[PDB]
Amino acid sequence: DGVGSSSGNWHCDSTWLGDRVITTSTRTWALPTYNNHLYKQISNGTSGGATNDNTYFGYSTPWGYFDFNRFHCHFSPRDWQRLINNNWGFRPKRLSFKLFNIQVKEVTQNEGTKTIANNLTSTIQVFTDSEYQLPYVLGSAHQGCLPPFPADVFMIPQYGYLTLNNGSQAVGRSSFYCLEYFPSQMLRTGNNFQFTYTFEDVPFHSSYAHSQSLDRLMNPLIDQYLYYLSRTQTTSNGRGVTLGFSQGGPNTMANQAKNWLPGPCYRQQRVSTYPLQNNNSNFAWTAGTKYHLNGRNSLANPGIAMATHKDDEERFFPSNGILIFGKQNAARDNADYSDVMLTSEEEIKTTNPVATEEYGIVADNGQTQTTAPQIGTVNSQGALPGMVWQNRDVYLQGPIWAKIPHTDGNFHPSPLMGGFGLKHPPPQILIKNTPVPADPRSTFNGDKLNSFITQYSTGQVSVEIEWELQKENSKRWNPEIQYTSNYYKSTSVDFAVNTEGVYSEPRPIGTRYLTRNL
Amino acid sequence: DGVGSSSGNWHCDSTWLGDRVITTSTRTWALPTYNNHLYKQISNGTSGGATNDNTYFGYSTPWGYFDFNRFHCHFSPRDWQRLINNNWGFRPKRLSFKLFNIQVKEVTQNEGTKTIANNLTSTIQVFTDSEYQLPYVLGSAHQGCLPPFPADVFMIPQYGYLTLNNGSQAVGRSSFYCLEYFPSQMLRTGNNFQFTYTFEDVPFHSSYAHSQSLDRLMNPLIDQYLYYLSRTQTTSNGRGVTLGFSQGGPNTMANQAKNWLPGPCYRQQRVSTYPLQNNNSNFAWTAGTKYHLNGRNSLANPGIAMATHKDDEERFFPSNGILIFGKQNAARDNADYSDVMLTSEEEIKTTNPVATEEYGIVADNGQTQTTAPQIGTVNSQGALPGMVWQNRDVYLQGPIWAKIPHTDGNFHPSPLMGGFGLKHPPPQILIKNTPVPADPRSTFNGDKLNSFITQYSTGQVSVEIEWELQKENSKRWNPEIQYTSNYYKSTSVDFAVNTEGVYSEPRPIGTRYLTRNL
Amino acid sequence: AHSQSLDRLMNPLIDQYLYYLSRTQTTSNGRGVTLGFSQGGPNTMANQAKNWLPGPCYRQQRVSTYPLQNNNSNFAWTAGTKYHLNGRNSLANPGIAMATHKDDEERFFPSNGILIFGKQNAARDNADYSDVMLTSEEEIKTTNPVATEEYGIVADNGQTQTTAPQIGTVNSQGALPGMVWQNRDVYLQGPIWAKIPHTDGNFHPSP
């Protein structure tokens, strides 16, 4: 394997075998030099216009990293359709990673002309953090993924991390990390890199909706043998005290005894899609739903999984309580409503409470002959025995996994942006250009060398994931709901390039179409 | 195999062994970057000056493809002569393909000076579509073949395809294809590519003419024992009704009973080579012979195989009903009659009807004593039991095969431009330069990379086809007609270069010289 | 369904090496006779040479779903598309497989040329249009001709200097070499099999 032989081939394919499917993707990347080969302290503090909520302390490194953690990395729109229409669930099993056909290039400036040449003896260096010894920066939903469309070339993002801070300052427990203090592999243009990984057992993502609601599980034809208190007061003659009792039945179903409870609630503020129906004020931050950690307020975004709206409320959404994707060429700041794509969790109404409404009612007081009953409203409810709930849905544009924090305890460790929680997630992959010094002085100086040759590198990357499928077995007589493409004529095809060669994704696509009994 | 060793050799040869011949060709190619590495939506619609007949919707890719589908790719004029003079038929058997001695080159502009350098670490990528999963664009008689003359260097054509349209717009069933979504092989300058293919059983092309005509198959010396109706009216005395009957014989041969029928007819409009004999008007489109598909009119070019003209009519040809080749350096649009070469199907008069004339006559009405017989003219005739016909001839400049459309049914699936119809034709071969990014910015941006280094590639291509021959076995006493070269002196040699180094082909050469009994 | 149409199989980016007759008459100066020739290309695609032909045609009469657009008369039987067997006329129902309508014609259907299912509790005789369910074969436009339109145009005569060209319209077309076609679709309410008649010969024995 010299300079004249390729170290790998292009693999983009999908294979559907029985109970599993295997996806494989190849992309072309470009890796710049970051920071001028330097580590740098970064911070932000309230001395400037920053509020206390936004302060941080950390470091930016001279390293890049690979991110394949979105679904459109591994699935074409047609492959995603086969998955969601035919299956009740899926989970990842194992992956392979390859890095090959590396070429390092040097650029030099003379006056205004720029030239690029090959540097055949330069290296890049790569390693995986397989012992989870670095701050794990995947799972924060950052940009810099492998592109959804296989013909696009992408830039590799810069690695950095945060530590503890007090304001803009570091405390005694703050940690610093040098990535050169890790063994890594060095590659010239004829070398290549690969590794394999196995996922730990994780539950299947549930791709389906319930065809029953938690409060409707009864037989509509039969009475219950249990009684409830239907009457505290005599109707006949005057008004007087009595105890009446009735059995629950077809017309009283709201009164019947039940075995189960809806899932937990943390209430969100309601926002209409028609702006004229909203109050006139800027309440996005002040009315936002937050948590409070070490004197510092953080918006709970999206939060726990709750139904977006109830029946015929579709114009409302929770303020910070949903995932929002941008359309192609949308602005970074202050984008309009026509520029973004709002997801809906509406399928989970059958089980989870609605995000913008109360959980229920409890008794505020005890009552007497002289004191009337008082009722409270429950806007926040933690886990109660007998609750059942659904997780948030996953999307073709959305994240796949997250790393579960290493802690004494946790409760239902499913990521709140949606995905698979993992104690040992796929390891993060660090990549860097090796610095090449410019000619030094001819007399010894002990200071470090600050003058380098300008370089960048390009190459190929492949990733292959095996997925396990859960087949749908159902006696439903009538046809299902399916994801489909519009039949009518159009100026362009959805999920294709336009006249200018730009690939766009028209809408977000969820996973829940087939149904199952509750 | 490094940068200093060649990955293949030059093979151009022909070998005649018994019942088979093997041809092999080598050419030099050049592959540009197309579209700036982009896929692009293309369309045409009636909003502009385009009529509804010419509308389309589709995509152009950044890929090239190889086309060897003309006969002059595989045969020298002398080899074609050996074939057509000595054999009654031939068909293809198997082929081999090689791609070797690849070299990638980078071109950079500084002011007005241009320089070209080798880029030793760059790749090209190649694949064959062997599962027939792409729109099959061969068999449309496009330019971009391997040149007929082995010393010429050719440019590789750009790949593209069409989908369904309504006007300039796409409908719901329109498909988009990314060719990067196919596994492909990547080659640096020291690598090479090859594959083999086997043709499915196909009938021999018939290279011969019939020495008998379908209506002359009788013994000229003997009467038939069958009778026909020769007389409806009394000749003697006055005019009166009678039924006369006669046996068919040597002088009545037009009246004899026969077992067979001429092939099908779709009539063409007649055009004289002497312009003064044609009507004065532009009737090429308005008088053209067409079919009508989804509200959109398409000229039937050339159409079903019919004889070009009858005896002593040689000055006439069917309007859109023949193949027309251009001479060397002929114009693209509005070329003169001396610039083009008209083929003639005249050999099939013995069987197929003439293209510009009616099929026959049928009865229009039933007759009575008061009603005289009425006759209709048959200008279009589909398949009747007892028909026999010949296919259109093949030429040294013409196509070899076509892909048979995948459909519920078809009738006599022989391509109408002439050739071998194939359910699984030789697979199409896609080739592309791998994009090499220019130096990116030193701070991360998430947009795709639009800036590249300009490159192109060159190399060698070999193709080898084995052909099976059908030997001629004949008791004819007198000598045959043969294809020959003119004996008389000339300014240049036919099928050679001129003073300027330009190779030309003087005339089209068909396959049908030897004869056979009908 | 096919995602391509039989007349669009070409590469949109490239010219053909074959020529066609584009010009019978001189544009410049006066009107005079000449022979012009052009190569087929991206903008001329209707003129290009092709290898294949659409399937066979037996034309049907056209009926609009909006009754106000139909002629005023009872033409169902008299304008019906028939065959004639032993002196006895039989409506050809549904007939050979043809596309129900072309683009943006969806309001039209062939008279006896489609399958029609009734809704629940529909009348036996003289049911209304809201009582029945019309199928559509529209998916086969890419290959088969439309049921209510002509197959194509052929030459009626030979031409001379004194005689102008005449064109005929082809309303019925049998099998030609190079045709391809699709069968009629099957439905959840429809039949599964049929018995092929026992005969000396048949052509494409699909029910």
Author numbering:
A (entry chain M), B (entry chain A): 220 to 737
C (entry chain f): 428 to 634
What does the study report here?
Adeno-associated viruses (AAVs) are helper-dependent parvoviruses that have become a leading gene therapy vector, with Food and Drug Administration approvals in the United States and a growing list of clinical trials under way. The AAV capsid is composed of 60 monomers of viral proteins (VPs) 1, 2, and 3, in a 1:1:10 ratio. The VP3 region forms the capsid surface, with a number of features common across AAVs. These include a pore at the 5-fold axis of symmetry, essential for DNA packaging during assembly and externalization of VP1/2 N-terminal domains during trafficking; depressions at the 2-fold axis and surrounding the 5-fold pore; and protrusions at the 3-fold axis, often used to engage cell attachment factors, including glycans and the AAV receptor (AAVR).
Importantly, while the AAV880 variant remains largely dependent on AAVR, the AAV840 and its evolved variant AAVhum.8, which carries additional mutations to aid with NAb evasion, showed nearly complete independence from AAVR, implying a receptor switching event. Utilizing 275,883 individual particle images the AAVhum. capsid was reconstructed to 2.49 Å resolution. The AAVhum. density map displayed the characteristic morphological features of other AAVs, e.g., a channel at the 5-fold symmetry axes, trimeric protrusions that surround each 3-fold symmetry axis, a depression at each 2-fold symmetry axis and shows high similarity to the previously described AAV8 capsid. Compared to AAV8, the capsid structure of AAVhum. is highly conserved except for VR-IV that displays major structural variation with a Cα distance of up to 3.2 Å. This difference is caused by the evolved sequence in VR-IV, including a single amino acid deletion that results in a slightly shorter loop relative to AAV8. Notably, the newly evolved VR-IV residues comprise of a highly conserved putative integrin recognition motif NGR, also located endogenously on most AAV serotypes. The remaining amino acid substitutions in VR-V, VR-VIII, and the HI-loop compared to AAV8 are visible in the density map but do not lead to alternative surface loop conformations. Additional structural models highlighting the AAVR footprint, as well as the newly evolved and endogenous integrin binding motifs, were then analyzed. These surface and roadmap renditions of the 3-fold symmetry axis further corroborated that the VR-IV integrin motif lies adjacent to the AAVR footprint residues without overlap. Compared to control cells, at least 10-fold less virus was bound to ITGB1 KO cells, whereas only ca. 2- to 3-fold less virus was bound to AAVR KO cells, indicating that AAVhum. binding on Huh7 is highly dependent on ITGB1 but not AAVR. However, it is critical to note that the AAVR residues are not mutated in the precursor AAV840 variant, implying that the newly acquired VR-IV NGR motif alone is sufficient to enable the switch to ITGB1 from AAVR.
